[PDB]
């Protein structure tokens, strides 16, 4: 294993924090606007997932978590980050700014070599664990792993459709506060309705069902669209999908299906429940999207609605490491 | 005008304070577990809509609000509440415990006569402002006015449908906490997942869109269903409805259809905006349902989603007041 | 060991939950208002501390947790609960209604034997770990363990005082919502300003600075008093304590005083942090009170302010376990 | 009357909307990072305060509110702002950046003349309404007007002291969120424990009790100091003062010192109540500081604790208004 974490906040850290609990190589970190000694404190403590326990302290000028020397670097320009002097071959791009094959590639200049963009990209392919896989192979150097939501409907589409089809469909995500969403009104000079007070409000949000779904499981590319509400909730989020379906079924079969798949092949990615209630239970639930056989579920013959919940902050976080992995296997020879 | 408001917490209250921004008659209130000096203090102040101005004091042993003595009484059972010695014509039920003609009816015994249920009834007619109207005449003694969510969907159904037909559809209301929602887990002995931490979580919710709607705008009795989530938000609540239409059209006209309404006949009930953002603004917006033309709206050819926000606590408040009135011109002759 | 936990809400549970991370003996549980089957569900799930892993299910008509048969009973009257056919000698009392020697003693009639009140009581002893101990011996049958604030302030008192003496103090507790605190106003028929909306508001609250502290640590019994603020927070709580000191010293020795103590004697019960920030970290932190060296601290000669945070839900829960324990050692022989 | 408001967010704004409720002059705004038509929308609508009714529109390239052409401008450095072509006599400084005599004088260069610091300064005088007054006269061109908390303490200390004296005192401010306080952990490079997540947590806050009170009411420059907790709460706030008195007296006369002051001199600045509870009622209460008489107030013969709330957003908003007014009486001749 060998990895690298360009920048580090929400994704940046759990991705790291994830690497660790999994079997991922410690690395190099590189985050301007955060000094070596804030990261220790800044990754050791977590409002929502919280604290940690490793040997989390600095030493010979860098971060040593759990007794393992992970260089940390800084530079407001990646064509500059070392990985030559450094020697971490797989880089993860966190930042937010550096989303396109053009903006990533830039890694190398410095000295570097293979990349994964932790967000949705306009040119870069767009892996999602279920289906990612095959579509994926070694030609690929700057792969991109489509978001949290996409990762939540991905699974859930695949089941639904292939198995009953999906002819047309809509989706509501009930997002739970994000980095952006301001503490109390203000600018979103671009994002305007989320310039507003993030804690008193139910606030719409343009999103992407369109996005990876079409872009990942292409038989679709054109049948799903969808929206989002951002709510006080600190970390969960329930994706709301309604389908005109195709193969008349019984809400029931919706059940069985997702179950048969929770174990069969979506094994670790889709989960399935009926042991109800839940709510932002999932907080810390390394998973991908879980099916709630019974809650917010409802049928009308071939017109159905399902609920799937994520953990936005870290189901995804585990995935980057799984995307991250999978490739090594293939990539490595 | 003579009123009566059996009980008073959320509806009981704002329906009190409703009455007086109108041209309503004061009365008699009758809330067990609540003494006269609690009420004044308990009406003067509202965390959500709050404070007031009225001459808010006890006098010659009853409530005097805005220098206009309105009795108040207490008894755990309405077949005993005065209205005899009282002289309070139309009586409104808030409590919750007394929902059906069987249970309202009982009013009389004490000495009574004219009544409306602030909630869904089993047997009771079920007027909604827009449509309620002509279906309703004086045969009806104990008529009910189905709820908050419903009140927000009538309007929007009736435009949509009548106008593009609606063949099948689905709905998500994002409720904002209620009376019920435990402040930190606990029994819901009957209502289990909203027993849970109503301020950490998004919690599913059986609801009634087929409810009032079907049993209000008959032609549908059967094509709509839906569910709910209670989110932190102290007072708002966006109704999400998806429809397979009937008459192909373009989310556009969904636009003008709702606009012509807001003005034409759906005057003061349905509202419509295009000046976006909005959020939990609506707080204190005597209205009923507001189409949000552009927000959490999406089209796909004859498959669509519309978004309208309520005000659970008092858009409905003004309605009882109008169901309440309407009743009088007709009823009184 | 052999226990019994009469009832189970916030305390009954984490008290259960408690026994088990220790080496406490499971038992019998006895809660009107809750079926067997809802317990399992109500015990393994938790907004704030959540999920568990236990062999969490029922069997030959009881609760088996982690393959260990704990009987469950329900009766609205404890002089009625088995402890007889039951064989469980130390009962714990969570309810809330049964706070006095008079009220507890009760137990026995049915058949039973030895008890602790996880509440503050009129007449029963009032043990708190740090100090409690010695003043405690086998005479006491229905001894009680004064609350969490107290649990919070004993150590922090005892350290300051014995050590720089303490001539007069005041205290503010920033409490973090409770069972009571209605989700949207309402009755508080005896408790009024915590009948109001407790997710919108900073709502004061009478409290027991005086309570258990005088009553626990004698020499004070007249020098401390306080108040509380309930804030949105789901679970932590910070005691703010001002003292006119006695022995001049410097904010500093306040520091070593507590640190030297974190290790010395208040060992597991007092904490001490200089590694700042913290905030409602402590979430799930089996402890007692932790002193935050530098945060919410301030000096001026011998007039000072100190800050310790709790975990009202579950530092306290460990303690009942400890109180519950020690007794055994004394009591048993 | 002529005003001018450099920048405009939380204060900038309500000082606009404050002026207006007044008899202030409209003006010209000047807020880089915000377009003419976002202003209008951003002036119009408020999560906490909200909406308006004004003739809120853009016209001949400026904002006309309430049919009053108030010019707007944009550039990232006021030594450049017009006020010469322009003609708005008194400039008010909001932004944040530009807090010193040095920093505002800067204004001039462009063309301008008179100024106020809606913020604490290091070199600019510090006027609070109660005491600012006389200390103030015309040799002062770029005057400063201490902040929220201060404004809340000023009156309360002023009565207490003068009147019972104040020897040693400490304070707790229970602030409610801020422009800054990140909604999900994160940077606070300068201010770290507030970089942490503002919505989950109770979070310390350095403050200045020391600040303007010392530098306001001369006589104390040295007897007080304090801290702050931010909580969820969107907008209200309560200053917690504990004091070693000097003149003995008893909780009570604390009452009437404060009550006779509301009427007498602190007339419309300190307000005082006993019809208790309140809470984050205050929301929009043009005022300054209100003494809650009986709420988390406690004596012990010359050691007390008085509680007073503010409305940080806009009690201070009206103040700028009259610091501003007053200046004009004098300033003009």
**If you consult CATH, what is the topology of the largest domain in chain A?**
Rossmann fold
Oligomer: homotetramer
Judging by the overall fold, what is the CATH architecture of the largest domain in chain A?
3-Layer(aba) Sandwich
Q: Which structural class should the secondary elements of chain A be placed in? A: alpha/beta
The CATH class assignment of the largest domain in chain A is Alpha Beta
CATH homologous superfamily (4th level) name of the largest domain in chain A? NAD(P)-binding Rossmann-like Domain
- Please give the share of residues in helix of chain A: 10-25%
What order do the helices and strands of chain A follow? Answer: EHEHEEEEHEHEHEHEEHEEEH
Largest sheet of chain A: 8 strands, mixed
- Tell me the number of strands of chain A: 14
Task: Estimate the global geometry of chain A from the Cα principal axes.
Answer: globular
Kindly report the greatest chain-chain contact and the residue count on each side: C-D, 46 and 39 residues
**Domain unit count of chain A:** 2
Distance between the termini of chain A: 13 Å
Give Rg of chain A in angstroms.
20 Å
Instruction: Compute the number of helices of chain A.
Output: 8
Strand order of the largest sheet of chain A: 3-4-5-2-1-6-7-8
- The proportion of strand residues of chain A reads 15-25%
PDB class: oxidoreductase(aldehyde(d)-nad(a))
Keywords: oxidoreductase(aldehyde(D)-NAD(A))
Assembly: tetrameric
Entry title: the structure of lobster apo-D-glyceraldehyde-3-phosphate dehydrogenase at 3.0 angstroms resolution
């Amino acid at each position: 294993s060998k990895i690298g974490i360009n920048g580090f906040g929400r994704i940046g850290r759990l991705v790291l924090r994830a690497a660790l609990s999994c079997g991922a190589q410690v690395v190099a970190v590189n985050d301007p606007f955060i000094a070596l000694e804030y990261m220790v404190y800044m990754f050791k403590y977590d409002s929502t997932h919280g604290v940690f326990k490793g040997e989390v302290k600095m030493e010979d000028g860098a971060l040593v978590v759990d007794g393992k020397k992970i260089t940390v670097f800084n530079e407001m320009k990646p064509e500059n980050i070392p990985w030559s002097k450094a020697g971490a071959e797989y880089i993860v791009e966190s930042t937010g700014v550096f989303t396109t094959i053009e903006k990533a590639s830039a890694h190398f200049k410095g000295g570097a070599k293979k990349v994964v963009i932790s967000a949705p990209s306009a040119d870069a392919p767009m892996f999602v664990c279920g289906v990612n896989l095959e579509k994926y192979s070694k030609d690929m150097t700057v792969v991109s792993n489509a978001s949290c939501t996409t990762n939540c409907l991905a699974p859930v589409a695949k089941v639904l459709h292939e198995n009953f089809e999906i002819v047309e469909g809509l989706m509501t995500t009930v997002h739970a506060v994000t980095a952006t969403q301001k503490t109390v009104d203000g600018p979103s000079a671009k994002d305007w309705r989320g310039g507003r007070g993030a804690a008193q409000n139910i606030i719409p949000s343009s999103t992407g069902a369109a996005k990876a779904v079409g872009k990942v499981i292409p038989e679709l590319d054109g049948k799903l669209t969808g929206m989002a509400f951002r709510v006080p909730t600190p970390d969960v989020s329930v994706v709301d999908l309604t389908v005109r379906l195709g193969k008349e079924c019984s809400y029931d079969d919706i059940k069985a299906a997702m179950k048969t798949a929770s174990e069969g092949p979506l094994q670790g990615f889709l989960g399935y429940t009926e042991d109800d209630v839940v709510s932002s239970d999932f907080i810390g639930d390394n998973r991908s999207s879980i099916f709630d056989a019974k809650a917010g579920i409802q049928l009308s013959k071939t017109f159905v609605k399902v609920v799937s919940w994520y953990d936005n902050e870290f189901g995804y976080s585990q995935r980057v490491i799984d995307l991250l992995k999978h490739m090594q296997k293939v990539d490595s020879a």
